């Protein structure tokens, strides 16, 4: 149908108020890895801040 499945997350756990654990469900059969990888590579390197 070319209309995908967008997730319906269940939890945003916020232990320690600075160390979060988000969950998302569901994704396509391969979208999990692709979104995780893109987000990781962006957040590690390309994320404007200050130091």
């Amino acid at each position: 149908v070319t209309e995908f499945l967008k997730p319906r997350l269940v939890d945003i756990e916020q232990v320690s108020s600075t160390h979060a654990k988000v969950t998302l469900e569901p994704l396509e059969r391969g979208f999990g890895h692709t979104l995780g990888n893109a987000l990781r590579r962006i957040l590690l390197s390309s994320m404007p801040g200050c130091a």
Partner: peptide, 14 residues
Amino acid sequence: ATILAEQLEAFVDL
């Protein structure tokens, strides 16, 4: 998420 959407902006058409 916003930074990647801005990256993509010049491609999507909706």
